[PDB]
Amino acid sequence: EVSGNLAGHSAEIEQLTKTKMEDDIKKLLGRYGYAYPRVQSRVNVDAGNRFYVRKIRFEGNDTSKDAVLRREMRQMEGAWLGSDLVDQGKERLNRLGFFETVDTDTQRVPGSPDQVDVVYKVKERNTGCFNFGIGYGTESGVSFQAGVQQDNWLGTGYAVGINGTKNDYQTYAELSVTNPYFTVDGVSLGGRLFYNDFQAYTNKSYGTDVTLGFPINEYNSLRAGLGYVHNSLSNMQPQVAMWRYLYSMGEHPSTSDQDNSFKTDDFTFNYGWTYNKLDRGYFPTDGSRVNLTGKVTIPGSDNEYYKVTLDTATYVPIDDDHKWVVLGRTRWGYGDGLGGKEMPFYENFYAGGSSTVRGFQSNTIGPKAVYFPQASNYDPDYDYECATQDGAKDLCKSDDAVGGNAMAVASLEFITPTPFISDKYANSVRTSFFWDMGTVWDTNWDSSQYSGYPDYSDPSNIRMSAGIALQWMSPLGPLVFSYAQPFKKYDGDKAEQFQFNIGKT
Amino acid sequence: LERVVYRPDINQGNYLTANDVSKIRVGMTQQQVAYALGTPLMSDPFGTNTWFYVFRQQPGHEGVTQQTLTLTFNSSGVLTNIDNKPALS
Amino acid sequence: EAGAWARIMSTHVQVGVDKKDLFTGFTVTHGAGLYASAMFGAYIDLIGKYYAGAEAGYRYHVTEDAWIEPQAELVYGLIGRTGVDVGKSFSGKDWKVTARAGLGYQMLMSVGLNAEIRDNVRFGLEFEKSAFGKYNVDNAVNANFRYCF
Amino acid sequence: AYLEAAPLAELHAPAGMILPVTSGDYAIPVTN
Amino acid sequence: GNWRQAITQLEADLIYAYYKNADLPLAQAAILTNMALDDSALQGFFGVDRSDRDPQHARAAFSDFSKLVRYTTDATKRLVFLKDRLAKYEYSVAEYYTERGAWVAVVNRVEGMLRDYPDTQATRDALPLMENAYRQMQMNAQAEKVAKIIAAN
């Protein structure tokens, strides 16, 4: 039987009842606002007093602006205390990714029977970094590379970064500024500008975009935006897939003619949808994340196409102490054109690399270029002779990836404890086992005209590899190292068994 | 969009219920009032011996509901008046 | 420490003796040459066959933070060549820096520096030049810097 | 920078108003 | 001498050398100024207002300078500076809550400023915040009192 000093909550306590139930009762009352109930047991519960929160203060925020932490709380000052109104605040801070640890505490107000002090403690993480360097010699000249990226710029909450490079063959730069909080209610605003002039064929492009978004629920948010890209191409090497597109656009390049040009002006509309219930920024143990984005063209553009990309992952713990965890990952996407227009090749999907599929060379998975028989000053000993009139008299096969219109990648990763625990590694290094596989294939591939060549429309040629990976959030930023051994490969494929990259994505 | 974007519920002030408000009577001491209702959250910073109990809630995509209770005391700490405003004008 | 060896191939037969620290030997066929090596901290690497050349060197210590190491090698088609490396290490209460340079006659020369800061600053560079060869590098430099916030 | 800080000056009340009682802290004595 | 000698001299006075090289974790072995822990070269260069950062170090510095006063001529002005810097923190918090709408927090937060920093500029600038907060409700007498204190000053 159950009895107690309850404020009428007999139905709720009966529902709870129908050895640990005493704590579920404590949680129920904490939701109502009793900070220190007493339960004895044939159980008698003394609800106690109602409590109010006197003030909220933070310690350890030496770099971040105070507004950054207060905006993430749900419990307001001058209101009754609730357990649900603080614990979510604790989870909320972890999702920013700006802290090493998050602690919570409840203190009594001296001399005040019904008031408490709510205190949060954080340790700020070193997360940003700036790099530059040069390369110079009389043989090639001097090249420059520099840029900066930070998630939190001087503690103001703004996500910014500037990158670019200049060398003898290409000019590239981008600038991005995003404000995660434009209004007090969580409305976001940001965008970017870029320039990409690649002189090597000739490939010159530039453009900008602006994106708006806002939350719609506690775990869901929406995004939308606009942008513009300029594309001017010239002297492209004739290819079957490339000319299919050109014919779709109404172009008629001369047969095997290296002297050509093409430019387009494409206006697009951006949108997306996200879900995020993860309990950590760097190393999560629970929840799942879904990121669905895409773009469509609008009237007045030269190209007519759409693109949808899905990126999601799920973490499920095995051990009660979250030392054994299993991670699933999958990526999906699809695109096409409208009105008879093919999707432009510069938006094609690529797969492979240390980031997307381990053990394969970056962007080497997928259909390969098929070159037509011209002449050049590189024919004697420097050019791809089968692309000229002398090296070949028919269509030449190659291993040159062109990208596709559809892809699918998935992997299963088994996350385990490290070989040992140390103060510098206990919460900074994690190791795991994985199984990676995926596939990229084309559409509108006319296998009836080209029979002696591979059929790129058959999605069943699945690429697969496996290996071991090491993650480290080093003082110089995230780093991931891994080794994998491919098992299933097809003619034209390339592999890299030892790969690493920056641990960002 | 103004009515679409999610907003968290905001609570302000002390909790009140009719079951407890009806228990206050003129002649009670400050200790009896604080015991029955709890510690006041607002007072007159400029010296008036009065306590303010304000219950205000503003749910998302909802209007504002509130009740204002003003308690006045004499120099002896004895409650002199009960100002009950069940709703905002 | 010593003994004879022989090997055969699918009618050709090659024989020789391995005899010993400086180790020497010879080889003949049934098509001849000599070889030797040593592991002291000095080393010897001698190869002579009916192409010739030899490399030898030793790491010398000058200071507790500096060293000199000759590693000269000769190549015969005689092409003169030699290589002697030097270096020094630096440290402090909150830092350590290593600088490196060298010269190898053909003549290749290079310099570089590696600095290690307390937590978020990494810097280094390299420069290459050469002289008196049939080809030469006049001046080339590479450098990088990283600063983390 | 600290040498450029503006001077402090106590606020006064209009007749009929009582100011909050100064807390027992952050008291700076008059010095030369 | 030179700070370069002071570094060499570290092989063997220690507090000065730690200060000169900003060895702030080592200067605490003396247990006078810990103000260096409230700033950053990057924040300084760009002119970032540090009023919204953690004030606990400033509070400790205030306590130690008070103990020393209870060099004095400059320490007094430093105490005035730190007191004003502390008042700015409360001001910023009050503005945040005003924007969010937690008017009850605004009223209690400002009242605290009135009790603790009655002589700083931050308090005079904060005063208009209470009138607004009172005008979101029907607590007109407090708004009248605030208007009267504002008009006098």
Side-chain angles (χ1 to χ4, degrees):
Chain A
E1 185 59 283
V2 58
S3 69
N5 187 29
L6 307 178
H9 303 105
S10 65
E12 294 78 3
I13 203 69
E14 290 174 356
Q15 290 166 349
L16 186 153
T17 300
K18 301 294 183 183
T19 60
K20 72 182 181 72
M21 70 179 285
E22 293 180 352
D23 296 301
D24 290 342
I25 293 167
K26 291 173 190 171
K27 293 290 286 186
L28 176 63
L29 293 172
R31 287 193 293 273
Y32 288 114
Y34 296 91
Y36 307 108
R38 298 181 296 163
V39 180
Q40 61 184 338
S41 178
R42 296 178 181 179
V43 56
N44 182 263
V45 179
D46 184 356
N49 294 322
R50 295 291 301 276
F51 287 78
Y52 300 96
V53 178
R54 186 178 180 88
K55 62 183 184 289
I56 300 167
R57 64 180 178 86
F58 301 92
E59 299 182 1
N61 55 318
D62 296 301
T63 301
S64 298
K65 185 180 176 73
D66 189 75
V68 172
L69 301 175
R70 192 173 298 279
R71 71 186 68 173
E72 298 302 341
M73 298 295 103
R74 295 291 179 272
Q75 177 69 277
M76 298 293 105
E77 294 182 335
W80 51 88
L81 177 66
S83 294
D84 290 349
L85 299 173
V86 178
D87 288 348
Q88 289 181 332
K90 183 180 179 182
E91 291 184 349
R92 182 68 68 185
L93 291 175
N94 284 335
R95 293 191 190 96
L96 290 171
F98 299 163
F99 307 106
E100 184 174 353
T101 70
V102 179
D103 293 313
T104 64
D105 197 5
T106 302
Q107 296 291 324
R108 296 295 303 273
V109 175
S112 180
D114 57 355
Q115 297 182 344
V116 300
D117 284 339
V118 176
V119 181
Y120 286 80
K121 300 184 183 181
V122 300
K123 184 178 190 298
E124 290 180 310
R125 184 187 290 269
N126 182 309
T127 62
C129 201
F130 166 67
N131 295 267
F132 69 92
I134 59 90
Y136 163 79
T138 59
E139 65 274 17
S140 65
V142 59
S143 65
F144 303 90
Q145 183 175 17
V148 61
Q149 192 269 321
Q150 299 187 88
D151 295 336
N152 187 13
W153 177 66
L154 302 176
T156 64
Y158 286 83
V160 301
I162 301 172
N163 292 275
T165 182
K166 175 66 180 67
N167 60 50
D168 55 302
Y169 59 89
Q170 69 181 35
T171 300
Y172 173 84
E174 63 183 304
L175 182 147
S176 177
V177 179
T178 301
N179 187 342
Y181 289 90
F182 179 72
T183 70
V184 74
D185 291 321
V187 177
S188 66
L189 178 66
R192 66 176 181 170
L193 300 94
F194 68 93
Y195 181 83
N196 187 4
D197 182 353
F198 181 81
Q199 297 297 316
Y201 61 87
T202 300
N203 186 352
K204 181 175 180 177
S205 66
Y206 57 90
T208 70
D209 61 73
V210 178
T211 300
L212 180 69
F214 58 93
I216 61 171
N217 207 321
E218 289 293 345
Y219 304 101
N220 292 99
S221 64
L222 304 175
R223 64 184 67 184
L226 300 171
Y228 174 77
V229 181
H230 179 79
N231 291 83
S232 176
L233 308 174
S234 66
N235 297 331
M236 295 179 80
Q237 172 66 227
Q239 295 183 36
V240 172
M242 189 63 75
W243 284 21
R244 177 187 60 193
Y245 168 77
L246 291 173
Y247 287 114
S248 173
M249 293 299 288
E251 298 290 330
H252 299 84
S254 295
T255 302
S256 300
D257 183 344
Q258 292 168 328
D259 184 344
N260 58 59
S261 66
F262 180 74
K263 64 182 182 180
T264 61
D265 288 290
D266 287 323
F267 295 87
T268 63
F269 172 77
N270 299 322
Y271 61 91
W273 178 93
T274 64
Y275 172 80
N276 186 347
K277 185 166 185 288
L278 294 171
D279 59 356
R280 298 289 186 275
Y282 301 96
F283 299 115
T285 62
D286 203 333
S288 65
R289 179 175 180 272
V290 182
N291 184 10
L292 176 64
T293 67
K295 65 179 78 167
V296 298
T297 58
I298 62 172
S301 298
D302 290 303
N303 288 254
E304 298 181 52
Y305 65 92
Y306 64 93
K307 183 177 176 181
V308 179
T309 300
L310 174 66
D311 186 287
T312 183
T314 299
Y315 292 82
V316 179
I318 298 168
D319 175 23
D320 289 345
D321 291 330
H322 301 176
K323 299 297 185 181
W324 296 95
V325 182
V326 57
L327 166 63
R329 299 184 68 189
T330 184
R331 183 178 293 155
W332 296 80
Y334 182 83
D336 209 328
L338 297 96
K341 292 179 176 174
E342 289 285 316
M343 186 181 79
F345 74 92
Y346 47 80
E347 297 290 343
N348 287 352
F349 291 97
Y350 298 84
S354 68
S355 65
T356 307
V357 182
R358 294 175 182 87
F360 290 88
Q361 289 183 22
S362 294
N363 299 330
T364 61
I365 298 171
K368 309 301 190 302
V370 293
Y371 293 100
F372 291 115
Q374 295 291 290
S376 75
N377 59 310
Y378 297 104
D379 291 345
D381 54 356
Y382 301 108
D383 206 353
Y384 196 63
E385 68 181 353
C386 69
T388 68
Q389 69 190 145
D390 297 302
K393 303 294 182 281
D394 205 338
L395 182 67
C396 181
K397 293 179 178 178
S398 76
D399 56 334
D400 291 332
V402 299
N405 296 330
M407 63 82 72
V409 175
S411 65
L412 304 176
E413 182 172 357
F414 181 58
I415 299 167
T416 74
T418 61
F420 66 93
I421 303 298
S422 66
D423 291 347
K424 67 184 177 182
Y425 296 142
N427 62 343
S428 64
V429 176
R430 191 168 71 169
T431 59
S432 66
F433 293 82
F434 62 87
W435 184 37
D436 297 351
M437 72 293 295
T439 177
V440 177
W441 68 100
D442 203 6
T443 62
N444 302 349
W445 174 242
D446 189 354
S447 66
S448 73
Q449 293 179 45
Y450 308 107
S451 61
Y453 300 80
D455 186 333
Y456 291 147
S457 71
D458 183 343
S460 70
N461 290 324
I462 306 305
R463 276 71 170 178
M464 181 178 282
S465 66
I468 302 171
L470 170 66
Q471 299 183 298
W472 180 29
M473 300 296 158
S474 79
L476 301 177
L479 297 171
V480 179
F481 297 86
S482 66
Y483 175 81
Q485 176 64 255
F487 305 115
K488 303 291 184 182
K489 63 182 183 180
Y490 301 84
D491 292 349
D493 290 347
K494 304 290 176 67
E496 284 173 344
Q497 299 80 354
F498 292 88
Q499 297 177 313
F500 66 93
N501 211 326
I502 301 300
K504 294 182 182 180
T505 182
Chain B
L1 186 59
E2 297 84 357
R3 67 181 175 85
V4 176
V5 176
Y6 174 78
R7 179 181 291 160
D9 291 350
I10 304 299
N11 294 320
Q12 295 187 60
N14 54 284
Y15 180 80
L16 296 173
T17 184
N19 288 334
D20 298 313
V21 172
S22 70
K23 294 174 179 167
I24 304 301
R25 298 291 183 274
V26 173
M28 290 176 70
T29 66
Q30 286 176 321
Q31 294 74 14
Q32 291 174 317
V33 172
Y35 174 80
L37 301 177
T39 300
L41 300 179
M42 295 183 180
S43 68
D44 181 7
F46 300 116
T48 303
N49 190 6
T50 186
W51 292 350
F52 299 95
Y53 291 87
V54 179
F55 179 86
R56 184 186 190 281
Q57 296 185 288
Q58 185 175 339
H61 304 105
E62 184 56 281
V64 179
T65 180
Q66 62 179 265
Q67 177 176 13
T68 299
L69 175 65
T70 300
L71 302 180
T72 61
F73 298 85
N74 64 12
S75 69
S76 298
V78 179
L79 187 68
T80 63
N81 197 6
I82 301 170
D83 186 13
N84 185 33
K85 291 179 167 67
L88 181 66
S89 297
Chain C
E1 294 180 353
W5 62 265
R7 66 183 182 180
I8 64 171
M9 298 181 285
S10 296
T11 61
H12 187 282
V13 180
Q14 181 174 9
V15 301
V17 179
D18 290 337
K19 181 177 179 180
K20 186 176 189 183
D21 288 335
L22 173 62
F23 297 80
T24 67
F26 71 92
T27 181
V28 298
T29 65
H30 300 277
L34 304 175
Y35 57 89
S37 66
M39 298 167 282
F40 295 99
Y43 70 95
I44 297 171
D45 184 348
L46 171 66
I47 183 166
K49 299 184 180 179
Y50 182 78
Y51 180 81
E55 183 183 346
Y58 180 81
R59 168 68 70 92
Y60 295 90
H61 294 259
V62 179
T63 73
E64 64 274 23
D65 63 7
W67 57 272
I68 301 169
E69 185 177 354
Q71 298 186 348
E73 179 181 358
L74 300 177
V75 179
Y76 173 80
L78 179 66
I79 300 168
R81 175 177 291 180
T82 189
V84 180
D85 294 350
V86 299
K88 185 172 182 180
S89 63
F90 307 90
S91 66
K93 65 183 170 66
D94 54 339
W95 59 266
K96 62 183 181 180
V97 179
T98 300
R100 184 169 179 173
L103 183 149
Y105 178 80
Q106 296 185 127
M107 184 171 78
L108 304 178
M109 294 162 279
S110 66
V111 299
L113 181 146
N114 294 287
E116 298 190 2
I117 309 301
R118 285 180 178 186
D119 291 299
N120 59 336
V121 177
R122 296 289 182 271
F123 173 77
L125 75 169
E126 63 182 8
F127 172 87
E128 183 178 358
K129 63 179 180 180
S130 74
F132 312 119
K134 68 182 181 181
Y135 59 87
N136 291 287
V137 179
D138 288 339
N139 54 74
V141 61
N142 299 305
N144 294 279
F145 177 85
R146 185 176 187 92
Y147 176 79
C148 297
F149 296 90
Chain D
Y2 74 93
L3 295 172
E4 297 177 352
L8 299 170
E10 296 85 357
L11 277 71
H12 61 272
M17 179 181 289
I18 299 167
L19 299 181
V21 176
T22 304
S23 69
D25 203 344
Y26 304 112
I28 301 171
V30 176
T31 67
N32 294 315
Chain E
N2 196 277
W3 62 267
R4 290 183 179 87
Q5 293 172 333
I7 294 168
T8 300
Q9 290 170 349
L10 293 173
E11 293 176 359
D13 296 301
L14 296 176
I15 301 302
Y16 173 80
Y18 291 146
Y19 179 80
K20 291 290 287 186
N21 292 285
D23 293 314
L24 295 173
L26 302 179
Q28 304 307 306
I31 298 168
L32 296 176
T33 176
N34 61 340
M35 288 182 178
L37 296 173
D38 196 42
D39 207 341
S40 177
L42 291 169
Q43 290 175 340
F45 178 80
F46 287 104
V48 175
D49 184 338
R50 293 187 291 102
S51 295
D52 291 323
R53 271 64 174 183
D54 180 329
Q56 187 62 43
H57 291 295
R59 289 179 183 276
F62 184 90
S63 181
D64 285 342
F65 285 113
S66 180
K67 290 173 188 169
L68 292 169
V69 172
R70 290 179 179 184
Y71 195 83
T72 299
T73 301
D74 292 293
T76 300
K77 290 180 181 178
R78 288 179 184 275
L79 290 171
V80 171
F81 172 76
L82 290 171
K83 185 174 180 177
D84 200 71
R85 178 265 179 276
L86 293 172
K88 287 183 174 64
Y89 177 81
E90 296 293 299
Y91 176 83
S92 181
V93 172
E95 288 186 346
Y96 171 79
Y97 281 118
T98 300
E99 183 178 359
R100 180 67 276 171
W103 79 270
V104 298
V106 173
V107 171
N108 283 342
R109 181 65 65 180
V110 176
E111 184 182 3
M113 291 176 73
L114 293 171
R115 290 194 300 272
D116 295 308
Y117 314 104
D119 62 6
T120 179
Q121 187 62 40
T123 300
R124 286 186 164 92
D125 288 345
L127 288 170
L129 295 173
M130 294 180 79
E131 182 179 356
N132 180 262
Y134 285 123
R135 290 187 185 282
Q136 294 178 22
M137 306 297 286
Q138 296 300 152
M139 291 176 74
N140 290 337
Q142 294 81 340
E144 290 175 355
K145 290 175 184 176
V146 173
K148 289 177 182 178
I149 189 65
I150 293 167
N153 291 270

Short mmCIF file of all heavy atoms in Angstrom, two decimals, chain A residues 174-194:
data_model
loop_
_atom_site.label_atom_id
_atom_site.label_comp_id
_atom_site.label_asym_id
_atom_site.label_seq_id
_atom_site.Cartn_x
_atom_site.Cartn_y
_atom_site.Cartn_z
N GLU A 174 37.13 30.56 -50.88
CA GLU A 174 35.76 30.56 -50.36
C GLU A 174 35.73 31.32 -49.05
O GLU A 174 36.73 31.36 -48.32
CB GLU A 174 35.21 29.15 -50.18
CG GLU A 174 35.95 28.30 -49.16
CD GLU A 174 35.39 26.89 -49.08
OE1 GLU A 174 34.18 26.74 -48.83
OE2 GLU A 174 36.17 25.93 -49.26
N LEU A 175 34.58 31.92 -48.75
CA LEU A 175 34.36 32.61 -47.49
C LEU A 175 32.97 32.23 -47.00
O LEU A 175 32.01 32.26 -47.77
CB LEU A 175 34.47 34.13 -47.66
CG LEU A 175 34.31 34.97 -46.40
CD1 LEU A 175 35.18 36.21 -46.48
CD2 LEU A 175 32.86 35.37 -46.18
N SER A 176 32.86 31.89 -45.71
CA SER A 176 31.59 31.50 -45.13
C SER A 176 31.41 32.08 -43.74
O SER A 176 32.29 31.95 -42.89
CB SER A 176 31.47 29.98 -45.07
OG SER A 176 30.26 29.59 -44.45
N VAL A 177 30.25 32.70 -43.52
CA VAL A 177 29.87 33.24 -42.22
C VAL A 177 28.44 32.79 -41.94
O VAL A 177 27.54 33.03 -42.76
CB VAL A 177 29.97 34.77 -42.19
CG1 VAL A 177 29.53 35.31 -40.84
CG2 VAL A 177 31.38 35.21 -42.49
N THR A 178 28.23 32.14 -40.80
CA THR A 178 26.90 31.71 -40.39
C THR A 178 26.64 32.14 -38.95
O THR A 178 27.48 31.94 -38.08
CB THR A 178 26.75 30.20 -40.52
OG1 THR A 178 26.99 29.81 -41.87
CG2 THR A 178 25.36 29.76 -40.11
N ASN A 179 25.47 32.74 -38.72
CA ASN A 179 25.03 33.11 -37.39
C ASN A 179 24.00 32.11 -36.88
O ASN A 179 22.86 32.12 -37.37
CB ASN A 179 24.44 34.52 -37.39
CG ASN A 179 24.13 35.01 -36.00
OD1 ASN A 179 24.04 34.23 -35.06
ND2 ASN A 179 23.95 36.32 -35.86
N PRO A 180 24.33 31.25 -35.92
CA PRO A 180 23.33 30.26 -35.48
C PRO A 180 22.15 30.89 -34.78
O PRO A 180 21.10 30.25 -34.69
CB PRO A 180 24.12 29.36 -34.53
CG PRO A 180 25.22 30.21 -34.04
CD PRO A 180 25.58 31.14 -35.16
N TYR A 181 22.29 32.12 -34.28
CA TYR A 181 21.21 32.82 -33.60
C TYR A 181 21.08 34.23 -34.15
O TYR A 181 21.91 35.09 -33.85
CB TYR A 181 21.41 32.87 -32.08
CG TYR A 181 21.22 31.54 -31.40
CD1 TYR A 181 22.28 30.67 -31.22
CD2 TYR A 181 19.97 31.16 -30.94
CE1 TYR A 181 22.10 29.46 -30.59
CE2 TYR A 181 19.78 29.95 -30.31
CZ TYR A 181 20.85 29.10 -30.14
OH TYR A 181 20.67 27.89 -29.51
N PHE A 182 20.04 34.46 -34.94
CA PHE A 182 19.75 35.78 -35.47
C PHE A 182 18.70 36.46 -34.62
O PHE A 182 18.79 37.66 -34.35
CB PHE A 182 19.28 35.71 -36.92
CG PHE A 182 18.94 37.04 -37.50
CD1 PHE A 182 19.94 37.94 -37.81
CD2 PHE A 182 17.63 37.39 -37.73
CE1 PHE A 182 19.63 39.17 -38.35
CE2 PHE A 182 17.32 38.62 -38.27
CZ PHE A 182 18.32 39.51 -38.58
N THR A 183 17.69 35.70 -34.22
CA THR A 183 16.63 36.18 -33.35
C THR A 183 16.74 35.42 -32.04
O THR A 183 17.44 34.41 -31.93
CB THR A 183 15.25 35.97 -33.98
OG1 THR A 183 14.95 34.57 -34.01
CG2 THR A 183 15.22 36.52 -35.39
N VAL A 184 16.03 35.92 -31.03
CA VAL A 184 16.06 35.28 -29.73
C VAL A 184 15.45 33.88 -29.74
O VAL A 184 15.74 33.08 -28.85
CB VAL A 184 15.35 36.19 -28.71
CG1 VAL A 184 13.84 36.15 -28.91
CG2 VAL A 184 15.72 35.78 -27.30
N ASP A 185 14.63 33.57 -30.73
CA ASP A 185 13.93 32.29 -30.80
C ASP A 185 14.69 31.20 -31.55
O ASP A 185 14.13 30.12 -31.77
CB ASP A 185 12.56 32.48 -31.45
CG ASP A 185 11.61 33.26 -30.56
OD1 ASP A 185 11.64 33.04 -29.33
OD2 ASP A 185 10.85 34.09 -31.10
N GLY A 186 15.94 31.43 -31.95
CA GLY A 186 16.69 30.38 -32.63
C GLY A 186 16.67 30.41 -34.14
O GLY A 186 17.02 29.40 -34.76
N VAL A 187 16.28 31.52 -34.76
CA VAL A 187 16.30 31.62 -36.21
C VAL A 187 17.74 31.82 -36.65
O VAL A 187 18.42 32.74 -36.18
CB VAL A 187 15.40 32.77 -36.68
CG1 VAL A 187 15.48 32.93 -38.19
CG2 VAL A 187 13.97 32.55 -36.24
N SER A 188 18.20 30.98 -37.57
CA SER A 188 19.57 31.03 -38.05
C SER A 188 19.67 31.77 -39.37
O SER A 188 18.69 31.89 -40.12
CB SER A 188 20.13 29.62 -38.21
OG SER A 188 19.44 28.93 -39.24
N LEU A 189 20.87 32.26 -39.67
CA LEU A 189 21.12 32.95 -40.93
C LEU A 189 22.59 32.86 -41.29
O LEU A 189 23.45 33.12 -40.45
CB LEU A 189 20.70 34.42 -40.81
CG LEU A 189 20.93 35.29 -42.04
CD1 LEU A 189 20.06 34.84 -43.18
CD2 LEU A 189 20.67 36.75 -41.70
N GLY A 190 22.88 32.47 -42.53
CA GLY A 190 24.26 32.44 -42.99
C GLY A 190 24.33 32.23 -44.48
O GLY A 190 23.31 32.09 -45.17
N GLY A 191 25.56 32.19 -44.98
CA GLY A 191 25.79 32.02 -46.40
C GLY A 191 27.27 31.99 -46.69
O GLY A 191 28.10 32.02 -45.78
N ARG A 192 27.61 31.92 -47.98
CA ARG A 192 29.01 31.84 -48.36
C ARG A 192 29.22 32.41 -49.76
O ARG A 192 28.28 32.54 -50.55
CB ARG A 192 29.53 30.40 -48.31
CG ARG A 192 28.89 29.47 -49.32
CD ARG A 192 29.54 28.11 -49.25
NE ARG A 192 28.98 27.18 -50.22
CZ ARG A 192 29.51 25.99 -50.49
NH1 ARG A 192 30.61 25.59 -49.87
NH2 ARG A 192 28.94 25.20 -51.40
N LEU A 193 30.48 32.72 -50.05
CA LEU A 193 30.93 33.15 -51.36
C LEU A 193 32.15 32.32 -51.74
O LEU A 193 32.94 31.94 -50.87
CB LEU A 193 31.27 34.64 -51.38
CG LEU A 193 30.10 35.56 -51.03
CD1 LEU A 193 30.11 35.89 -49.55
CD2 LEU A 193 30.17 36.84 -51.85
N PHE A 194 32.30 32.04 -53.03
CA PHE A 194 33.48 31.31 -53.49
C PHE A 194 33.87 31.72 -54.90
O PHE A 194 33.07 32.27 -55.66
CB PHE A 194 33.22 29.80 -53.47
CG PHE A 194 32.21 29.37 -54.47
CD1 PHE A 194 32.60 28.95 -55.73
CD2 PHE A 194 30.86 29.40 -54.17
CE1 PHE A 194 31.66 28.56 -56.66
CE2 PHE A 194 29.92 29.00 -55.10
CZ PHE A 194 30.32 28.59 -56.34
#
